[PDB]
Structure formats: structure tokens, C-alpha cells
């Protein structure tokens, strides 16, 4: 069982090396947005601090580019354990080496220091390539959750062949908390996309494209209102305001199921509702059947007494009472049909319970 | 007959949704086949009671002139006979085919508008034509249709 | 059976008196729209023809106000037949007399002749009260369909207590033809509402509010685009452009079920699809199981021959082949689970068929 | 049973103290909107009546701040009854005392009199904090409904463990009346939010932001049209026009289920529809099978008579008749498959009824 | 079996003649868009190349008009094989000859050469009638797929009566790849419709209607945003921007089901989720039952020791612990109800398995 | 054979969806397994009648040259044999395997376009080749394919 | 009684949802009818155990003054008796109607906050009133309500 | 053992999802209870075959050191033993527990990339260690793991 203690050792070490990579990538994005803002609000009076922040971004992307290699040097070392290999050259495939090189290129992009407030043409796309360092999130979310290492989860998942991955833990968090996730996701998209658009359209002279306009342009585009008071002007604005609209249609078609689930009855509450409406309708039928005799006996009374206008007054009420009685009874039978349609499944198990009495 | 020819010509296909064998009459089995193909599950007693409401000769089966009397009621809007026949069953909780004095004096007093228990003694004395002490079904419809 | 020949006689007479009332109401609306247009395009040069069309509207609303009374004088005469009455004073209730008086007031409104191109303030609301003479449509649609008189429909509906009315024949026509109805309804709303809005906002000097603008304003409001090139100006324009938007949201929530039904498989076609994908996946499994031996035997061959780089070349392909075999098999078992989940109902009847062999 | 008479006594007293608190909170909001409007339309000529209305708001919020304490002094007194306590210090928890203090702070906010037509910066947020006195509504709705005290409801709910609360009575009123609620809720939101927005953007000089603009801006934002004729200008306008858009998307995803339920068939009506289409398709098959012989016998007739062009005329009609017969039969079998798929549940109970005959 | 070798021969020949017709129609549309663009960007300096491209369009529509006749001369020849005909005059019906004539007229329309940068009024509708040569696509898609000729598909479809046609292969490709199809369809509509609209509105002087405006106008109309920065001006622009909006509402009502399917659990994963939440809730119940004794024993301890404030401190915690225990247990029983509601179907087969033990 | 080689090579896998055991023939049990895995529930009589339509030798089972004649009909678009075989069953309501003169004279007169009852006597006299008084199935297809 | 009149008048209809026959008492069959019409499937032992919790006289059936004691608990918000009765069942895993020293020493030590095994010996010595070595149900509620 | 303490402490609760009685071992009944509560329906032969794969002593039941060897395989990503055990079953269509020369020469020739029938005679001669003429399961895994 030496290939089972070492597996938990390597998996804890990868959880640590997947936490620190996410910290050093969030630090890079957080020092990128600071550089892009103090170049705008500052100008050329703060060139020392611009150079200092650029060099700090270079350091905190070098340590990320080391920790990704330190994570794959644990994953190859885990794959050699799980299959009994000794020569590491057998384990390292071609597609995995291509994945490592692509993953190092994507976390390599940063506004490196080469040596009046707008960004450049190149250091505005390198700065907006830092946002592609968010493939590190589902890796750390999977490895920090215990489901990859907890023994009871793995045994029950092996009996049922479910293969714990990213789309399983996503459905776990989406079906245990649909509220926190869907609110703190849209309030994390309406600020990230509002910053990206307020990079894509800055106007120096009039101050007509910053966050005060994009935090209003993007919820309006997301909810498919589109007033037209503010409209994106560049071409990179027009790409982002189409991506936001597509995500808005998709999240509407997502919310249309979550709201559809909640307003329906619980299965145990609908039976209480039906069982109370049944004894309300029985009471209304017993009222109406007394109304019918209350009018018919007065009609026979004034028929014998030959009060003719009283007979023509009560025969009309007799016909109206019969008309009410039919409507109450046809509500009652529709509800009894709803009852007989829903408890068919329990009727199946009840008839099988009455068939259980056939052994002796 | 008083009925015209094309109406008989169109009631014949309505009769031959039940009379599938073309025997000239309807039994409980041919009725139950249609009742189950419409999606509801009767019992044998319920099917036999549906037959016995319109069986005039008393043969246990329904032929076409008995079918015409059944379709003379289910063609109009408010079948005034069934809405009295089941208002008779709302009272008769014991199912004995009778309304006793206690059943009537229970229902008509507490439910309605404050009707006295002295009027029920006059009503039951007027209703019992045969003097059977209690209200039948035959006198109950003759009170409604007076 | 004298109360069954007379019922079919009266019901045919009401079908005729419900066809001619609809003809004489459509004629009134068709002569109303003509008056409202040749007052606009004509002015005061055609006052003779305006007076002539107004008097023709008065005649063709007088005959409608006679045929509605001739229809209720058949319906009371039918209600006296169905219950064996002789004195008509018993049959005519209070709510039915109130319905008759309201129904005569609503078909009484028309631009009557009292004695520069705009309408008046009063003869533009009397002219747009003619459109409330479309309660005559579901009456004529019910009585012209045979379901109220056909004997087999009534007998099967009496066995099942369904009570043929307007909302039943509407669901009949909606579930036998969802295409003709939903297209010829929106192409009958986008022209009626486009005319009503082009009554509500006419501008004399610039010609900026007629049908050329409203036939573009109303589909854009209905589909919830709302460009803003044309915008309604009055208050009666702003009421109509909210009614159109509400009807657009409702017809979107109507079309979202009709399109949901059609793209799904037929029940018999899904079994053919699954039964063909099963024998495709069996063929892929039998390919992959041969790939595994094709690599493992070459690995044993070069293991004996001690060609070391060939061993490290084929052991990698062995591990990749096992990795492919697991994925093919886990597609296969998910599809076999879809098969075992759908044919459970036929499995119930099959086990009951095997329980049918227990009588002797 | 002294702990059951006192419970109904205290629960009736809380129903009274939850009705009067809602009356005295509605009076406060109704005297707040009056102050905010006669400060605008009046100016400084009506300062006496402004002071009088402010003091009346202070009185009718003092009595509300007394009745909330009088309600919790009945709820603690009920909780001491239900558990047999005598020392009240045991009953009053910490979270409940925090709830009482928060509930007294929220109903304490009002525009109190400290001593040219705009509101202040502070007495416009205290005035719009009066609308947070609508947590009193679900309390009074629960306690006025009989379900908290009616014995049969409580016994059947205790057999089924349903625990009557606010979200149960909400589903009760939503599933017994989806029409009155969803109409009188949107016509109570499109006027409240239209007043709140017409507080958030008032322009003195041009009169360009009052209710005549917001009663058009808010349905247009709610239905996600967004023309752009009127657009909110402040920041508090832009918050409210996003809250309205979110509520509009949610109520669209709510109405999409209510309209989905209504247009479908009743369960008993679909069987009548299928049973009538079956005997229509049988009649069409018996027409088409006669068409086939009607053409084939004429083809044999002209085959013997050697009228060659008549043979080539009728063989084409024979092939067309066979082509029609196949299409009619394939409609018929699809409908018979729809019949055999729906009445499977009744077939299960029928086979169990035929298995019920196996006891003797 | 001579009528089965010839059928596969003719069906392969029709697959070739349905591939080459689609190639020669795509060439015609691709040489039409080139003519319409180099008339605009070129003017009258390139009249030689305009005449050359028009004559090439005439040649590559003549060969299409020959291959459609060569396809129907194989389909009549197939219909004569399948029914044993010899005289072809019997096979060629009237509706099929009308279909052939209509299909030759529709592929006959092209901008033929009769002999400053706008198109004509006629050669802009003949050029936009080339896009009606896309009925050739579903024909070639059906005949290139093997399902019309593969023997196992036809035998299993004949056992189940499914009749392989265009709407079956469409559902095949839509239910095996909902992603590639729905993305490469909208990215083939947002460029075709963007070219058609940029034919419908070209402005010579200002360059205000070309593809740079329509590639922004059409996704905005499709997603029902409708800013209003660009608005179509002609009447043919206003037709196309309504067709795009209708297709956008339909594809939203299409995507609302595809996104509804994907986020739900797999059937095997929900059982793992429920079976793990059960043993989490058991652990929480066993914590809470120990909390209850941990407080009650300290309450009895200080009850004997008569430390009165400690008794009033721990009795409150006892009541809070009982309040927590009830909530944990009512979560547990709702989840056990979800378990007992879902595995009813397997319980049916289990009770039938226990009824299988009744033969001896 | 007249058939080519690769087509036989692809009909072999179509035959081995039914012949799972590789025995060389198909019985009603191997057919019923596929019929139930496709989701429909036949009876034993329905399965045996499906076998008896294409069983040429009469052995009760189907081998591959009998399978080829079955697939020669289900490969084309309109199987012209089945659409006459079941138009024969639409007439034969009694199920006796015969069309009497009364069945034909009932269907062809009232339904169609006003066809005389004199033409039916000539048609039945021309149709009965064996002189059996009524129309068989064998003469019914020979009238269609004349 | 201490209860008022209209409350008895409204508990009578609550009692007559169970007592359908009007016999004056409730058996397990009338209870099981309501339990199945509410959609859940009890066993006979579960129904009998539901009866035996509130049967005071011990007759096997429930009459109306026994029903009032049951509705005195299910009317209030937190039924403090059931939430101790089932916290007693969470401990008694063996189902013997007793909590042994081993069951208590297993649950209260490892789960909670680090409670000693010396305190359990004092607790079990204080809890056993009868000196039966282990904790009953009767002493368990008397410890809670002290 | 080589395993640490807290890992044994967490495998104990994984073992006590199956061993509900606390007996110290797992039978087919306790396995089938969990298998049915997860929603799938095994047979008795399938459950017994699931037991017999990891039963080392041969007692018919599974104890905890046998459970550890089972969880040493289902903890890692690709269980390389099962993916060879069922690739062995893809070949053995007759189910005899053997791969004959005909089964191997059928599968490896027509499917793959054009492998000769001469190489199969060398492969089967190298594979049969016992000289049993055909390929076992024991030699099949020893060829994979060479
Ligand atoms: Ca019969
Ligand atoms: Ca009779
Ligand atoms: Ca009675
Ligand atoms: Ca076989
Ligand atoms: Ca044979
Ligand atoms: Ca016959
Ligand atoms: Ca009783
Ligand atoms: Ca008792
Ligand atoms: Ca115990
Ligand atoms: Ca055990
Ligand atoms: Ca063992
Ligand atoms: Ca073998
Ligand atoms: K919009
Ligand atoms: K919209
Ligand atoms: K808009
Ligand atoms: K707009």
C-alpha cells in the first residue's frame, strides 16, 4: 500500500501548489489594473511608480511560471505512481507537453518594462491577456474540495461510475447554492466587463467613456434593454457589447429554470392543499343541495296556495339553484380527478401490498 | 316517429361506437371497453348501475329505442334529471335508498338560512305519499316537478 | 322526442343568425375604416360621400341590433324547450337581461350623422368602439363548428363530462393547426393595431404618424426591440404601445412551448437512434480492444529484443490505448443506462406478461 | 387544557395588533407622499400645512412604534405558554431582541420636523425609508388567514409535516388566484416605482421628470423595450431602472410557466380528442381503400378493352391512390401510438385488476 | 434481385449529381457577391471584368440547370424500377412535372448580361434571387449521409416505421452536435443577412450603410437589444430587420431548451449526491442530539447547585438546541422524501422481483 | 447471383442483428428480443404472422436467402405489396380471409362516388377465378397487378 | 371543561375527518385511509405505534378526550415532547428501549466538545432512578424537564 | 502498516457504509442494499461475481484488509486492472473463460490495421504458458504487464 500513502502526499502537495498559483495570479491581475489606472489618472509625473509596478508584475508572473511547472512536476510524479512506472520518459506524453507549453505561454503574457495617458497598442492587449490567467480557478476549486480525496465519496462513486471532475463539482455548488453563485457571479461579471470596456473606450478630452458610463452601459445591454443614451464607439467596444448580450440571453435561459423550480408546490404540501379543498367542496355541495329544497318546497307551497307571481318568482330561483349545483359538482369532480391522477403511484404500491398477502 | 330521418341516420353511427359487434344491443362489456379506452376505470357495479338507469324493458341490455331516450337527455345543456338524482344522493348518506326524517332534519336545519324544525314535520308529512314514514326517490322528483 | 327535433331546428336557426350578425358587423367596421380614411385624404370636398357612408353605417348597425335580439329570442326559446317551460317569464333571468342590454349597447356605438381633416373628439372614440363588435366571433365559430350538434361528440363528451364550450374549440383549432392560427393572428394584429395607432397619432403638417410609421413601430415594439427611430407621441399612443408590448411578451411565452414540442424526437425514432448508436459503440469497443493487443504484443516483442527506445515508444501507446478504451466504454455504459431508463415502462408490461403465465 | 384556550386568546389579540400596525403604517406612507407632493406643487406658501403633516407623521409613527412592542409582548407571552415557562428572562433570546431593536429602528425612520420646492438630501431618504415599513404585510396576511388557528388544517399538516408559514400561504394565494395577484401586483409596482423614480429625478425649470414621464419610462423598462425617448439622468434614477429591469426579467420567467400551464389540454379532454380523431381516420381509410379499387377495376376494364391512353390515365391514378392510402395509414398508426403511450397507466391498473382474479 | 442492384447504382449516381449541383450553385452565389462588390468599389473602370463575371455566372447557372434535369431523370428512372414500370409516361405525374418546372425557374434567375456604382432595380433582385438556390442543401445532405442506403438502418426503420427523411437527419445532427450546428449556423446567418442588408441600404456620398454598420446592426437586432445608433432606412431594410428579429426570438426559444437540458444532473450522479447528503445529515443529527444532553445535564447540575443565573443561562441554550434539532431533522426527512420519491420505479421492479419468487 | 459482393457483405451484418447466436436462421424468439428492445410489445400470434409472410420453404424459421426477399421490399420507398395487403384487410372486417359479396357491396357503394350495385355483380363475377362465390386474397392481388 | 364551547364545536369537525363512520372512536383502519389519501404508505406496525402514543385507557382505539390531548401538542409551534422522544431514538441504535452505558459513552464523548469519560459515570449513576444500570425513557424525560 | 493512522481512521467510515450491522465483514445482502439504494438493480450472480473479485481468503465475505486492496485500485484515476479485465471479456464472446485461436484470429485480423494471420500463430504459441492450446486470463495479464 505504498502506492496509496504517496498518492495522498502528492495530492496535498498539489492542493498547496494550486492555492499559491491562484494567489500569485490574482496579485498579477490586481497589480495590472492598478498600473492601467494610475497611467490614466497620473500621466507622466509618476513614471517611477509605473516602472516599479511593472517590475513587480514581472516578478509575480515569474513565480507563477515557476509554480505551474512545480504543479506539473507533481502530476507526472502522481501518474508514475498510479501505474508503477520508473522511467519518467514513458509517462510524459506529447499532448500533455503541448498543454504545459501552452499553459506557460498564457501565464507568460504581462506588460513587461521595455524602458500622454493612454496605453500603447501592445501593452493594452498584454494587460488584457492577464485575464486569461483564470483557468487556474477550476483547478484550485477542485483540489481544495475534499471530493477528490475523501474515501467514502470515491467508493460510492466507483460503485456507480460517476468520475468526479470539474463539471460535477460545478453542479454540486450550483444545486446546493443557486443564489450566492448566481448573484456573486453577475456582480463579478458586471465589474470585470465594465473595466474591460472602459479600457476599450477612453476619451481624453471629454471624459466620456470611463466606468461611470460602462457600469450603466453593461447592465442595460445584459438585460437587453439597450436605451441608447450611451453606445460603444470603437470596434473593441462593439465586440464586448455583443459578448455581454450573448451572456445575458444565456443567463436568462438559465434563470428561467431556477425560477420555474421554486414556485411549484412541495410534493407533501399539494396533498394537504387537495385534501382541504375536498372538504371545502363537500361543504359547498351540502349547502347547495339544501338551497334546492329550500326553493322547491316554497314553489310547491305557493303552487298549492296559487300565489302565481310567487310561483314564477321561486321557479326562477329553483332553476338558478340547479345551475349553481351543477357548477359546484363539476368543480368537485375535476378536483377528484386531480386526486386520482396524482396518487396513482402510491396506488400501485398499495395494490402490490394487497398482492403481498397472497403467499399463504 | 316524430324524429326526422337524417337525425336517425346520424344517431346510428353514435350507437355503433358502442355496439361494435353489430348485434343490435349494448352489454356491460362493450360499454366497459369504451369506458376504459377513454381512460377511466369503472367497477362492475358502477357499469351495471349505469346500465340500469335507462334500461326500460328490464332485459339487462340496451337497444336503440332505449338509447334514444338516453340521448334525449345528454344532448341538451343542463340535464335537469341528473342534477336532482344526485342532489338526492347528497342527502342519503346511509345509502339505503331512503331519506329518513333525521337525515332531512339534520341537513335542512343547520345549513341553509335558519330553517325551523317545525317546518320539516309538515314537509315530511306532505312528501310521504305512500305513508312510508320517510322520503322515497319517486316522491322526491314529484316534489321537484310540481 | 318532440323536444329533440325542435332543438336541432332552433340550433340551425341560431347558426344562421350568428353568421349574418358577423357579416353585418364586419361590414360596419369595413365602412368605418373607409370613412376615417376618406375624411383624412379627402377633407371637405367629399362631404356628400361622408354623409352617405355614415348613413350606411347607421343602417348596417340597425340590422345588427335587430339580429342580436333575434338571436336571443331563439336562445330563450331553446331554454324553454330544454326544461319544459310554457310561460316565458320564468325563463328570462335578470343576469341574462342585463347581458342582452349590454350587448345591445356595445353594438349600438357608431359614428352617427349629426348633420379640417382630423376626426372629432367623440366620433373618433365611437369609431374605435366599433372594434368591440368582435365578441360575435367566438359565438359564430362555436355554432358553425359541428361539435355542438354532432351526436357522437355529445355522447362521448357526456361519458367523460367535458362540456363543449369556447375554450374547448379554441384548444381544438390550436392543437390541430398551430401554424395557420399563430401566423394569421399576428398578421391580423399587426395591421389592426397599426391602424388604431395611426388613428391615435396623425400629424397634419409633416405627415409623420400614418401607417408607414406604425407598421414599423408595432412589430419593433412587439418583438421588444424598440429602436427609437419612431416613438409614439400622444397619450393614446403610449397606451397602445404598452398593450402591444404585453401581447408580445405573452406570445413569446406562448411560442416558447410550441417550438419546444417540435424539435424533440418522436417516441419511435429515439429507439431507432439508440439501437443504432449501440451497434456503433460495440464496433468502436472491438476496434479499441484490438488496438490494446496490437500495442502490447509489440511491447513484448521489443521487450524480448531489448530495443529500448522501441519499448519506451510502444509503452506510451499502450497507455494511450487503455486511456481511449476506458472513454469508449464509459460512453457505451451511459448509453446503455439511457436505454435501461426509457424502456422501463415496457419492462413493467413484460414482467406482467411473464406473470400472466401463472394461472395454470 | 389551560395552555390551549390562552393560545387562541393570544393569537386573536395578535391578529388585532397586526391589523392596526398595518393601518398605522399605511397612514404614514399615505401622509408621506402627500407631504412630498405639496412641498413640490406648493413651495413656501403652505409652510403651516407642511409642519402639520410632518407632526401627524410623527404621531402616526409613534403609535406604530408602540404597537410593534405590543405585538412582541404578546409573542413572548405566547412562547412562555407553549413551553410552560414562568420567568420571562428565559424566553427572551438574544437574536429575538436584536430583531425587535432592528424592527423598531426601521419603523422609526420618518421626516421629523426640525423647525425652493425640492426636498432636502436627508428628508428625501427618510421619506423613502417609509417604504421599508412593508414587512408588516406578510405578518398580517398570515395572521388574518385562518390557517394558523383552524384545527383541521393543523391536524392534517401535523400528519404530513408541512409547517404553515409565509411561503405556504403565498403559494396558496398564488395557485388559487394567479390572475388577480399577478395583475394587481404589477399595477402596484408600476405606480410605486413610478413615484420613487419621480422623486429621484425632478427638474424644476422644464418639468421634465415627473410622473407623466416615469409612468412611461417604467413599463417600457419593465418589458425590456427601452425606446430611449426618456432616460433617467441621476444616479438614483439609474439604480431604480436596473431594479425594474431585473424584476421584469424575473416576472417574465414567472409568466412563462403560468401561460405554459393553461393552453394544454385537460386530462379528460385529450382522450375525447383522440377518440374522435380515431373514428375520423377510420373513415378516411375506408374512403381510400374504395378509391384503390375504383381505380384498379377501371384499369382492368380498359386493360381488357385495350383503350391504351385510358390505361395510362388510370394506372397513374392507381399509383396516386396507393400513395394517399399509405399516408393516411401512417397518420392512423402514429395516433394509435399516442393512444397506446398515454393509457399505459390505466393499463397497469387493468392488468392488476385481472391479477385480482387470482385468489380463488 | 435485379431491382436491388440497379437501385443502389441509381442512388450513388444521384449522390454524385447532388454534390455537383451544390458545387455549381455555391460557385454562382460566390461569383454573384463578387460582381455586386466590384461594381461598387470599381465603378465604370472595370466594365470588362464585370461582363466576364456575368458571363461566367451564366455558364455556371446553365450547367446547374442541366444537372437538375439530370437528377430528375435519375429519380423518375428509380421510381420506374421500384414499381416495375416500363412506359415512362405512367411514372411522370403532374405535380412532379410542376415541381421540376418550378425548380428550373428558381435556379434560372441570375444577373444575365444585357450588354454610377449602384446596382439596377432588376439586377439587384435577380442577384438576390441566387440565394434561393439553397434548397439544394438538404437534398445533398440527405443523399451524402449513408442512412438512405445502409441496410441495417433501413431494416430497423422498417420494423419500427420511421421513414427516413430530411427532418429525421436534421434531428440526428441536432441531437448529436447541438454546439457546432447552433454556432456555425448563427455565424452563417449574421454574415449572409449582413450582406443582404448592405445591399438593401448603400449610400454613395457618406458611406453610411455598408458591412461595417450592418455587422453591428444585425447582432443587436437578433439579440433584441436595438440601441438605435444605426437604424435601417429603406423599406427593404425594414423587412430584413423584422425577419432577423423573428429568427432571434425563435432561436432564443430554441436555446432555452438546450441550456435547460445541460445543467441538470445525470441520473446516476443525483443518487450519489443524495446518498452523500444522507450521511452528512445523520452526522449533524448525532451532533445535535449530543448538544441537547450537553445543555440539559448542565441545567440539572446547576439546578441541584441552585446557581440561578447559570440555570437561566443554560435553559435558554437548551431551548435553542431543541430548536436547532428540529430544523436539522426536518431537513433530513425532506431529503428522505426526495429519496423515496425518485427510486419508486426501481421499487416497482424490486417488488416484482420479490413476486418472481412465487412460482414454487 | 445478380447481386454484387459488397452488398452481400453489408447485408450480412444486417442479418446478424437478428441472428445473435450465429445459428444461420431466425426464430420468433430472436425476433421478439429485437422487437422488445425497440420498445413495442408484440404477441406470439403477431410474431408468428410476421414470420409466416416471408417464410418460403415453410420451416417456421427464416434463413438468409429468405431474408434477401424481405429486404428487397423494405429497401425501396413505397412497398406496393403491403399497401394492397392491408387494403385487403380494411375490407375483410369478419377476418375470415375472404371478401364476401355483401362486404364489397357495402363498402364500394356508400363510399367512393355513387357507384352502382349492378357493377359489383360484374366485378365479383370477374374476380372469382376459382368460382368460390367470393373474392380471395390471391385473385385480389392479380386484379391489382393486371 | 376549561376549554370554551366554539373551540369544541370546531374540534368536532377535525375529529370527523378521521371518524368517518361516526362510531365515536378511531381505529388503525380509519387512520390508514387518511394516511394513504395524503399520499404516504405506512406499515401496520407504524400505524399501531402511532396509535399507542396517545392511547390513555389502553383500549387500542382513540376517542375524543384522547384526541384533545393529541391536539394540545400539535397546535403549538415547537412540540417539545416529540423533539426529545426522537432525540432518545437517535441514541438507542439497538432499539431495545434502553440506553446502555456504552451507547451514551460512545455518543457523548467523540461528538460534542471533548467531554470526559469520567462525567458519564456520574451522569449514568444520577440518571438511573430504579437502579436498572442503564437509562430508560421515563428517566430521560425527567432529566430534560428538571 | 505502511499506511498512516488518520487514513485508516477515514477508511473505517467508508467501510461502515457497507457493514451496517457492525459485524466485521460484508456479505452480498449488505452490498445489495447499498446497490439498490443507489438506484441500480443487480442480480444475485452479479453481486456474487462482484464479491469474488476481491475475496482473497475465499470465505465468501469481505473483511477490512480485503477492503483496503479494493480501495487501493478505486482511489486512483485509471484503474489499469479493470480496463484489461474487460478487454479480455470483449474477446471472449462464448464466455468460456478462454480465448481460443479462432476468436483471436477473428478479432485481430479484420479489425485493427491489416494484421497477418501468420503472426497470430506465433502470438498464440508464445502466450500459452501451460500449453493449453488457447489463451487464459492469467497469461493475458502477464502479457500486458511484461
Ligand atoms: Ca353489442
Ligand atoms: Ca332493454
Ligand atoms: Ca337514508
Ligand atoms: Ca438464430
Ligand atoms: Ca424458411
Ligand atoms: Ca369477409
Ligand atoms: Ca370510527
Ligand atoms: Ca382509548
Ligand atoms: Ca440501547
Ligand atoms: Ca456486515
Ligand atoms: Ca474474505
Ligand atoms: Ca472463448
Ligand atoms: K430592447
Ligand atoms: K428585449
Ligand atoms: K431598445
Ligand atoms: K433604443
Swiss-Prot record, chains A, C, D, E:
The keyword Cell membrane applies. It catalyses: K(+)(in) = K(+)(out). The keyword Transmembrane applies. It is found in: Cell membrane; Cell projection, Ruffle membrane. It is a multi-pass membrane protein. It holds the Pfam family Ion_trans_2. Induction: Up-regulated by phorbol myristate acetate (PMA) and phytohemagglutinin (PHA) in T-cells. It comes from the Eukaryota. GO terms for molecular function: calcium-activated potassium channel activity; calmodulin binding; intermediate conductance calcium-activated potassium channel activity; potassium channel activity; protein homodimerization activity; protein phosphatase binding; small conductance calcium-activated potassium channel activity. The modification Phosphohistidine is found at residue 332. The channel is inhibited by clotrimazole and charybdotoxin but is insensitive to apamin. One of its GO terms (cellular component) is cytosol. Keywords: Calmodulin-binding, Cell membrane, Cell projection, Disease variant, Hereditary hemolytic anemia, Immunity, Ion channel, Ion transport, Membrane, Phosphoprotein, Transmembrane, Transmembrane helix, Transport. Signal peptide: none annotated. Residues 260-321 are annotated as: Calmodulin-binding. Homodimer. Homotetramer. Heterotetramer of potassium channel proteins. Interacts with MTMR6; this interaction leads to selective dephosphorylation of PI(3)P in a lipid microdomain adjacent to KCNN4, resulting in a decrease of intermediate conductance calcium-activated potassium channel activity. Interacts (via the C-tail domain) with CALM1; the calmodulin binding is constitutive, does not require calcium and mediates calcium-dependent gating and four calmodulin molecules bind to one channel tetramer. Transmembrane helices S5 and S6 form the ion channel pore, which is surrounded bymembrane embedded helices S1 to S4. The S4-S5 linker, which contains two distinct helices, undergoes conformational changes upon calmodulin binding to open the channel pore. Intermediate conductance calcium-activated potassium channel that mediates the voltage-independent transmembrane transfer of potassium across the cell membrane through a constitutive interaction with calmodulin which binds the intracellular calcium allowing its opening. The current is characterized by a voltage-independent activation, an intracellular calcium concentration increase-dependent activation and a single-channel conductance of about 25 picosiemens. PANTHER family: SMALL CONDUCTANCE CALCIUM-ACTIVATED POTASSIUM CHANNEL. This is Intermediate conductance calcium-activated potassium channel protein 4.
From Swiss-Prot, chains B, F, G, H:
There is a cross-link at residue 20 (Glycyl lysine isopeptide (Lys-Gly) (interchain with G-Cter in SUMO2)). Ca(2+) 3 binds at residues 92, 94, 96, 98, 103. GO terms for biological process: autophagosome membrane docking; calcineurin-mediated signaling; cellular response to interferon-beta; cellular response to type II interferon; detection of calcium ion; G protein-coupled receptor signaling pathway; G2/M transition of mitotic cell cycle; long-term synaptic potentiation. Pfam families: EF-hand_7. It is found in: Cytoplasm, Cytoskeleton, Spindle; Cytoplasm, Cytoskeleton, Spindle pole; Cytoplasm, Cytoskeleton, Microtubule organizing center, Centrosome; Cell projection, Cilium, Flagellum. GO terms for molecular function: adenylate cyclase activator activity; calcium channel inhibitor activity; calcium channel regulator activity; calcium ion binding; calcium-dependent protein binding; protein kinase binding; protein phosphatase activator activity; protein serine/threonine kinase activator activity. Ubiquitination results in a strongly decreased activity. The modification N6,N6,N6-trimethyllysine is found at residue 114. Keywords: Acetylation, Calcium, Cell projection, Cilium, Cytoplasm, Cytoskeleton, Disease variant, Flagellum, Host-virus interaction, Isopeptide bond, Long QT syndrome, Metal-binding, Methylation, Phosphoprotein, Repeat, Ubl conjugation. Ca(2+) 2 binds at residues 55, 57, 59, 61, 66. There is a cross-link at residue 20 (Glycyl lysine isopeptide (Lys-Gly) (interchain with G-Cter in ubiquitin)). The modification Phosphotyrosine is found at residues 98, 137. Changing residue 139 to G: In LQT14; decreased calcium affinity; loss of CACNA1C calcium-dependent-inactivation; no effect on intracellular RYR2-mediated calcium release. Its main location: cytoplasm. The modification N6-methyllysine is found at residue 114. Ca(2+) 1 binds at residues 19, 21, 23, 25, 30. GO terms for cellular component: calcium channel complex; calyx of Held; catalytic complex; centrosome; cytoplasm; cytosol; extracellular region; myelin sheath. The modification N6-acetyllysine is found at residues 20, 93. The modification Phosphoserine is found at residues 80, 100. Residues 6-41, 42-77, 79-114, 115-146 form the EF-hand domain. The modification Phosphothreonine is found at residues 43, 109. The N-terminal and C-terminal lobes of CALM bind to the C-terminus of KCNQ1 in a clamp-like conformation. Binding of CALM C-terminus to KCNQ1 is calcium-independent but is essential for assembly of the structure. Binding of CALM N-terminus to KCNQ1 is calcium-dependent and regulates electrophysiological activity of the channel. The C-lobe interacts with KCNN4 channels in a calcium-independent manner, whereas the N-lobe interacts with the S4-S5 linker of KCNN4 in a calcium-dependent manner playing a role as calcium sensor and gating the channel. This protein has four functional calcium-binding sites. This is Calmodulin-1. It comes from Homo sapiens.
